[PDB]
């Protein structure tokens, strides 16, 4: 409803594409392992959508 | 919009014998499925019954 409030976050943290979004999600959830797109996809699917 | 009160009886629930027995049955069934999956593959020829 108020998009400029979130636009502040967008500007401060930088826009993400799908690939790098999953890369960063995998990096933060499971550190110490090499990032993978399929890894992040499987992690999300097992976490919330199973 | 309004913040929530956690002691309100509209935010609290009652669980009785049915739900707790359901949870115990679920745990036992998960263990049983693990045993079944482990045992089913040990035989090459079928020679098997449910």
């Amino acid at each position: 409803r108020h998009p400029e409030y979130y636009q502040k976050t967008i500007d401060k943290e930088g826009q993400f594409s799908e690939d790098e979004a999953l890369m960063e999600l995998y990096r933060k959830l499971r550190p110490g392992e090499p990032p993978t797109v399929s890894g992040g996809q499987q992690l999300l699917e097992s976490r919330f959508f199973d | 919009c309004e913040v929530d009160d956690i002691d309100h009886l509209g935010n609290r629930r009652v669980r009785s014998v049915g739900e707790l027995l359901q949870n115990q049955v679920r745990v036992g069934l998960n263990r049983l499925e693990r045993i079944i999956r482990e045992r089913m593959t040990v035989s090459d020829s079928d020679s098997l019954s449910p």
């Binding site: 550190p31 110490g32 | 482990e38 593959t41």
Partner: protein
């Protein structure tokens, strides 16, 4: 070419079972190109028992461990780790940044010396 030997840490009491299941897995997955061979080493020593029977006890040199010959690949690593009743690969260990437990392990291939030593 890159046929390296690795040692896999196994749960207590599961040595022949894991080897049999792993051989079935590789033969049904038709992935012999990556996973080559699985083995456990034994030696049939002879011992006197309590009832006087001269019993041939087949003792494992390395209890709790299995030996494989394979080529390191992410798919191969993922499909050997997913085998039931296996803990991890023995190798270099890393500290866990968040939590308390065993972290990422980097497998270490066996040098030709000891694999030639054992296999004879």
């Amino acid at each position: 070419e890159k046929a390296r030997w690795y040692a896999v840490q196994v749960a207590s009491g599961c040595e022949k079972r894991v080897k049999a299941t792993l051989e079935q897995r590789v033969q049904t997955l038709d992935a012999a190109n990556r996973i080559l061979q699985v083995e456990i080493p034994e030696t049939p020593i002879v011992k006197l028992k309590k009832d006087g029977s001269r019993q041939s006890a087949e003792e494992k040199v390395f209890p709790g461990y299995v030996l494989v010959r394979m080529i390191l690949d992410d798919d191969a690593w993922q499909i050997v780790r997913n085998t039931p009743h296996v803990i991890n690969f023995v190798g270099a260990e890393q500290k866990r940044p968040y939590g308390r437990g065993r972290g990422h392990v980097k497998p270490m291939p066996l040098s030709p010396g000891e694999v030639g030593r054992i296999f004879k």
